[PDB]
Amino acid sequence: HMCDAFVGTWKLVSSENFDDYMKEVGVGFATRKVAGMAKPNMIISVNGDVITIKSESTFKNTEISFILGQEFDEVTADDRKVKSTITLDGGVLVHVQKWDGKSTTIKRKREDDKLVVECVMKGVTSTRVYERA
Numbered sequence: 001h002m003c004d005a006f007v008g009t010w011k012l013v014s015s016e017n018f019d020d021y022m023k024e025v026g027v028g029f030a031t032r033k034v035a036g037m038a039k040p041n042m043i044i045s046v047n048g049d050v051i052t053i054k055s056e057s058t059f060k061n062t063e064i065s066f067i068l069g070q071e072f073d074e075v076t077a078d079d080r081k082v083k084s085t086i087t088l089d090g091g092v093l094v095h096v097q098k099w100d101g102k103s104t105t106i107k108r109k110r111e112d113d114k115l116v117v118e119c120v121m122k123g124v125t126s127t128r129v130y131e132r133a
């Protein structure tokens with residue numbers, strides 16, 4: 001019953017400062033412009049200890065499966081090759097990505113009927129709000 005309130009199909013309904021977050025990450029112009037248009041569906045499921053998060057979008061489809069606390073390889077939508085670790089901290093899913101001596105953290109939490117995603121790189125935060133699809 002780990003992560004029950006996250007499970008389901010979610011649609012992006014608002015974004016703030018995502019271009020600035022991508023700039024801070026190092027994303028190039030053309031990827032920022034095209035990726036910034038996308039309104040992905042995020043599909044979250046749990047089977048035993050394995051959590052799967054899929055992102056279906058007109059930009060790029062991605063999928064990760066993981067066990068909490070156990071590092072894994074991830075290729076991000078912008079084609080970074082990162083080492084990721086995802087934990088639960090007080091009911092918030094905390095996803096840290098490490099690559100090229102850099103780090104970014106993505107937090108996902110349930111707030112009312114929304115799933116709120118906060119993406120932080122250095123001093124820049126982007127907030128991405130999802131509703132049930």
Ligand SMILES: O=C1NC(=O)[C@]2(CO[C@H](c3cccc(Br)c3)OC2)S1
Nearest residue numbers: 022025027035077078106117119128
């Ligand atoms: O709502 C979101 N939920 C996530 O986990 C995000 C998935 O996309 C990445 C991303 C970073 C840089 C460039 C591109 Br293209 C994508 O940012 C995090 S956005």
